Amino acid sequence: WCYEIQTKDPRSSCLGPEKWPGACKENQQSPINIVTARTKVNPRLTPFILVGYDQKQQWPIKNNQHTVEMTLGGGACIIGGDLPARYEAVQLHLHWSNGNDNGSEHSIDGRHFAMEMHIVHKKLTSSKEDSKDKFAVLAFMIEVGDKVNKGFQPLVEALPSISKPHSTSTVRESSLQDMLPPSTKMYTYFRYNGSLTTPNCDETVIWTVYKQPIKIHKNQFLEFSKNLYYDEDQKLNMKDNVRPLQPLGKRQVFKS
Amino acid sequence: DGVGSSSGNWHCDSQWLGDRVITTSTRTWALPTYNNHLYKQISNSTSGGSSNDNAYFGYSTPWGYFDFNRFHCHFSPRDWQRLINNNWGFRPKRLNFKLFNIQVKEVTDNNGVKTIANNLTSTVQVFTDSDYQLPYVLGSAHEGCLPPFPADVFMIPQYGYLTLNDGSQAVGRSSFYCLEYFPSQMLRTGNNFQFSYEFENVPFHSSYAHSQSLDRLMNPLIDQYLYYLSKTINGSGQNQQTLKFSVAGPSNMAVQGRNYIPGPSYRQQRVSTTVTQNNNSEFAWPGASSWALNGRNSLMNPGPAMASHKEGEDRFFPLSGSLIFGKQGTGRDNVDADKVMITNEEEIKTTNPVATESYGQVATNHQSAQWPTSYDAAQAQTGWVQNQGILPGMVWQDRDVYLQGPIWAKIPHTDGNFHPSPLMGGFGMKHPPPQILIKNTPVPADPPTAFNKDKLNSFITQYSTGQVSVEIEWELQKENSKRWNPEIQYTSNYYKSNNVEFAVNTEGVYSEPRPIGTRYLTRNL
Amino acid sequence: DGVGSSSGNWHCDSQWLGDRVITTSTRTWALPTYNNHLYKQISNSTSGGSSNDNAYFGYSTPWGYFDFNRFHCHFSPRDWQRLINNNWGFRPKRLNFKLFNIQVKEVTDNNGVKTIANNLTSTVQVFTDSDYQLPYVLGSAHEGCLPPFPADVFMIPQYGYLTLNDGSQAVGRSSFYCLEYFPSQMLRTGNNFQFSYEFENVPFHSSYAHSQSLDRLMNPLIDQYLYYLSKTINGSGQNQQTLKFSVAGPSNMAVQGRNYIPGPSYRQQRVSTTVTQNNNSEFAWPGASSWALNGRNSLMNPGPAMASHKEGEDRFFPLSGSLIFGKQGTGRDNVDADKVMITNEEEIKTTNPVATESYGQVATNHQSAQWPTSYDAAQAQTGWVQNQGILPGMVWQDRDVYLQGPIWAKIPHTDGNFHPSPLMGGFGMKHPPPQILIKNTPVPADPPTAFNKDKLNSFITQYSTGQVSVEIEWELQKENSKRWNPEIQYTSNYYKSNNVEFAVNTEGVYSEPRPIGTRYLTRNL
Amino acid sequence: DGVGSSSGNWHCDSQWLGDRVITTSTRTWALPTYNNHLYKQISNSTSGGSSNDNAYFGYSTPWGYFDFNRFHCHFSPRDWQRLINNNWGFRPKRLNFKLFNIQVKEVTDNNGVKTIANNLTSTVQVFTDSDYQLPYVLGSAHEGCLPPFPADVFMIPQYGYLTLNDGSQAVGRSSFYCLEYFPSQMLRTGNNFQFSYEFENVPFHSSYAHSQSLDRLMNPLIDQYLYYLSKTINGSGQNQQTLKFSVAGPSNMAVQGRNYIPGPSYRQQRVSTTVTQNNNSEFAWPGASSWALNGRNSLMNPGPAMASHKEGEDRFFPLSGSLIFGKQGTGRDNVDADKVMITNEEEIKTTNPVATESYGQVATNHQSAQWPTSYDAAQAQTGWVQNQGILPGMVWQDRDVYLQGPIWAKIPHTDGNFHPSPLMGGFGMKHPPPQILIKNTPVPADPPTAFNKDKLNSFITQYSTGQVSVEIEWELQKENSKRWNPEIQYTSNYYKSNNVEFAVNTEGVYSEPRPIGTRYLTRNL
Ligand SMILES: [Zn+2]
């Protein structure tokens, strides 16, 4: 119901991450520390084939209160990797903090990043099954404060329009490729069976998280926290919408 | 017959028969020998390198042919005007043609003293492709038609055709045609030729513009008995899901139920006449809309009939969606806009989509909430339609015709076609006016005194001239409009000019200052 | 007999024959004066001054018109049941319209006291636009029709029309129509009016649902003599390619060869009647699917006929792809879902694609190994088809008609159209039943004793009432099905109900509980 | 009658007339009992709960049926050669079917001795669905046709059909048909049956290939009087936009204006017979191109008629856009390319788009400059068209037919269709030849001596044989081409071989070594 930062006032009595309902109290959750020493290389892991990631079109951007989610529509499927059949992009949200020290979702060798971006792909057809492997989300790390990339520029421009929670706007025009690292860098990643980073966790996600973070200007990162708020009144910002790390358990993380 | 006797008497006049009008035109037509007297294999190679998209192969025939597939070959400016200021529709019903007063002459450039003398005993071979057995090139908007100004003398174009080509090479399927493999009439100076033809039934051309728009046909005073989704969220915030419905009425015509929709489309790049707001880039070909065939792309030149631009967008024109004519005296290559006349089809904006805009938008996903997994929270996403094919309930107008534009075209002989109105404008016919081929007869001239199996070559220089006469019957569609206020009419402008529009100048040169359409009268949808 | 005798009887009935059914209906109407006897120009600036999408320009007339373009104006619920449970097809053939028992009244309402007397003189003018020279507003699903319940007395709606507009302004092409420029009959008490109309050749409406699906027409016991690609890379995993083929048969119906494919489509957004799985955002218009005309956008209201939803997904409906009727007494602005009745078209799911689903998939590149060319390689990629036009071999069904839905529509007078069946349902005709215009003749009050000059604006306050009868003969297409098992039929429910469906309540208010289609019987594809 | 008397003669031959040819075929068939004389419900589950895409519901009947919907059932290879080498077109006109020399058998399968004898008093049932009241399964390219070899004896296939289904379940709309609910003739050894049928009017099949291309219809020597945009920028530098126009002439045929365009398309994935350049991935179904119906996906099989490959790339073929036949002896599952014969349609490249290429390119934006809001300055952007629906001005050819391909198909009974030429080739007909159903009348075995209610389940084992004859008159379209050079003709190859093509081997096995189309002769567009 609520992040740990939100449950800091005497009022606004909601359930923090330590008391999240549903199936979020189990072994596999999602946010784990990825030690590169203990991971084993899987030869079958190959870079994904990004079809429809080069098209430019308007995207719906809205203040989901807990984060900013961008609807990816159709025609942005993924067929590469070791995914069962193929997955189609449906949503794009991200998590950040007030500085590149607190962290964002996943950590590599105990190292966190300024911002974490979650591109979630739903299973294309499958069937009416309750089985796992229903979502194949791509995780990208973001931590840099030097140079501005035009890929994230329309997103930052659209950020002020959704300042209040439950507000809707639209990105002017951009492509998914521009917001991703160069294809020459998208070669190494990790796969682990996590459930969900949001409450009512369901163990149906592949969680292919990439190394080699993306670089955005520090001004854009500051605007992310400055232009967003949790409550209806512009009092509490959206700094720390990050779930605390969870035990790895007996799950084994593979490396490409 | 006989030299001392003509075979024709100048016939040019036009007679309006109320619901009809007969056009008559006569003209002189000089014809040369052409490619000596031989057929010549031609090809991309022959032309040169052309291009993959310009690759070809066919033959240059030594024959020539007559042509009048242009309204101006039959209607005078005054004639047109009237037609267009007084009828909703019009169409050809027949044609009668005649060649006469033919004179064949031989030229003798006596060491620099070219001397023309009459060869009273020579002939021109003429025939029609009535059974349509030869490649039909009369539907390609080429030059070589009877000039619009009767006093002008004409040269008669040369007949040539194309077949299948692999690059510059031919294939076994390729065909060769010999026009001498056809029966033909031989005419001496005392002889003449004539034939008549019946136009197959064709739809009247729409010489009008609609006074209503497809999206504005409802009663502006009465509500519809239908409802539309007005809201999806209460608003305030947080789980606001709701379904509100409202009656569609005069206040919101946009959301009202409709029975018919606009015609199909194939987006074209927009181009501004003001070359400052365009784009500093060479995009003529790169930004052109095109189609491919057997690995060969061809520009969507006329393309589907689509409104040239939105109300007030005048300065804009689809990269390749309009007919562009050259003004009198205009050069052949890289001429400025001020040298050409670009047509437009604004009139059809009432039913046809704008050529430089998307047809519309379509849903591309299933909007949803986090109702299942917290994912699936997808917002309604839509996409733009750049090209829209035919849909039931669609309606549309065809491209207008012009005085200086083409009249008819031959529908390709295929298993299937749809709405075969020629895309450049006019009337499409499976059996249109047949091609009338004409070529003099090569004089064998000097032969050797000892047998020569080698075919002859020296042939005596000659050329031929005479008169052609085409008459076309056009049925007319009258108007019974109840419109109160005066209609829009095409008129010349009184304002003191240097030269009358559509006339000759001090040098005796004719000039069609502007293209003239046919859509001035108005009628309801 | 004048002022003492009747100009007519009530009639209003139904006669069913073997292959025919003539319906008769008579109702009581009242006509006000409208526009104070005058014509007035109307525009969005005059009324709303709304956005460009809803801009308009037109005219309001002092005339009224008769409307009976809905099935319930002629068919009783029972009549309707008999029709739909016993006939595979139907269509209108002829019509008899008549007016009578005209009564014109004046209104005193003086110094407070309001009184009513009859003006035995006075006149009502009546004329039909049999020549179709006036804008046709009967195909826009408007209110103002003959009440479904015969005992209801109704008021004639006011006639108004729209012409061309640029914003709220008019253009030179816009047309002003004056109804007094049309010949008309004037009628005193004792005079009656009558006219007959013959319906054009229209196809029978499909009052059936298919018992088979386009993708299931093959014999389930026999294989095909055709093969399909089954495997491609002998599994393994290095550099192994292969082409394995297999016979298409009962086990893999999905890949069998087929001769016909489903009809065209134009994707619509999906909305759930259970407001929780929808999406917490306003998308009614944002994601509505639409088309554009001269810079103006119009929704895809009942656009192409598509299956409303996948089998068992009734909770879902296309945003603007279905007809939505209002229940008795429902408001006009922002009403709840329980106050309206959303129709569906699941019966056509056997041949038409689902309205909220992509038509299919299509290849978008060339799959190749790396060696081809160099070290590029490529995997087979496909893309979704959101809007698909018309292709040869397509088959589809048209929109169903409803007891409360429209009957006919006027096909727009354009050069070309495809399958001109109205998208809201019914029969499309080039010359549908002519509009019937009606008006009370103005009666000046008392003029000055000195010649003025200007038009009279002082008039006696009057209104008219009378009876109207309409009779329509409908042709029927019977069924000769060999189906062994019983069929689905429209039936009332026996369960106790405070009120009887399709009847008046304790206050005498007639209501139609639900929409009734026509597709209950079944036949093979 | 009865035994001792022949009921019919053989009759197997062809008769060629000027514009007609009558084929006559006679064959020997055998007919078992089938479902032990029972009707049975079948379904995906029944079989083995197949995929959603492969789910079905239907019934299996103890009836058999006659299938001769293939060209090799009537035309000998020799005869086929004369048909395609001398006629530009052809079509079926009328037919006569005959069943004769019945003869059934008892087969007393005692212990090991199956002992077969004749049951003279046994009956066979036969009836034609001339009213088309039964599911039509003859348009699904199933096996069970009259053998091409007039000497091969064949078994009648069993009749089965499918109705509506929800997964493996039926719905109330589903229909059940009992064939015994139809009047049927009963025949003993001395009885015969015959019926005649007239084919509805169908277009002649195009048994020719075009000698011209849609993009090469112009005179290669004459310029057009239309201009095209040649340049947009004077050169490099910066702010230097311009508009230069040029005459479209022979040297730049690619940009010439044209009246007609290529037919529609639905892109298919390209596959190479060279399994080294395709891919190291399984993409048969992933990248196959398909269409959806009520949530079920069906492969776009032959689909729209599109050229199989670009002139030259014969190694390529559309994933599922061509007809694939199995060679003699070829198995049914995962067979190699060497075991199958893949057809192609290169002949239609003259008018139809290439199956594995985009239809063309379309604009997607408005090129703009650094005007107010210089940060804008757009750039001409275009997009590929993978699926193009019908547009006015389109022309196309239909898929070719083959000696081993189907002849006709039943057009689905619907409100609408477009160009209903069966996608697999042939003639589409609303009332095609009626299905001929046949069944061994059950002969109960010894009943009990005390009355029992249960239906009988013990029956004398029986099977029937006999002869069948079918005669079809075909109308021919003679050619009067003026092409000089010889044409391409289908011909056998003289080079020596172990066997004769289209004959039997040392084991008496007959075989068709290759598919034979009909497009050898040529004609202009
Ligand atoms: Zn997340």
Residue numbers in the entry:
A (entry chain R): 22 to 277
B (entry chain A), C (entry chain B), D (entry chain C): 219 to 588, 588A, 588B, 588C, 588D, 588E, 588F, 588G, ...
Paper text:
Carbonic anhydrase IV (Car4) is a newly identified receptor that allows adeno-associated virus (AAV) 9P31 to cross the blood-brain barrier and achieve efficient infection in the central nervous system (CNS) in mouse models. Among the generated AAV9 variants with higher efficiency for infecting the CNS, the variant AAV9P31, which includes an additional sequence (WPTSYDA) inserted between Q588 and A589 of the wt AAV9 VP3 VR-VIII, exhibited efficient CNS tropism with 385-fold higher EGFP expression in the mouse CNS and 1000-fold higher EGFP expression in the mouse spinal cord compared to wt AAV9. Here we report the cryo-EM structures of AAV9P31 and its complex with Mus musculus Car4 at atomic resolution by utilizing the block-based reconstruction (BBR) method.
To determine the binding details of Car4 on AAV9P31, AAV9P31 particles were incubated with purified Car4 (amino acids W22 to S277) for 5 minutes before cryo-EM sampling and data collection. The final resolution of the three-fold axis block is 2.28 Å at 0.143 cutoff of FSC. The 3D classification in BBR shows that the bound Car4 has major contacts with two capsomers, either A/B, B/C or C/A, with very similar ratios (5.11%, 5.06% and 4.89%) and conserved binding behaviors in the three BBR groups. Among the two interacting capsomers, capsomer A contributes the major interacting regions with the bound Car4. The inserted peptide of capsomer A deeply inserted into the catalytic pocket of the bound Car4. The residue Y588eAAV9P31-A of capsomer A has close contacts with the residues Q112Car4/H114Car4/V141Car4/P156Car4/L217Car4 of the bound Car4. Residue D588fAAV9P31-A of capsomer A form salt bridges with K143Car4 in the positively charged region of the Car4 active center. In region I, the backbone of the inserted peptide in the Car4-bound state is pulled toward Car4 from its native state by ~2.7 Å.
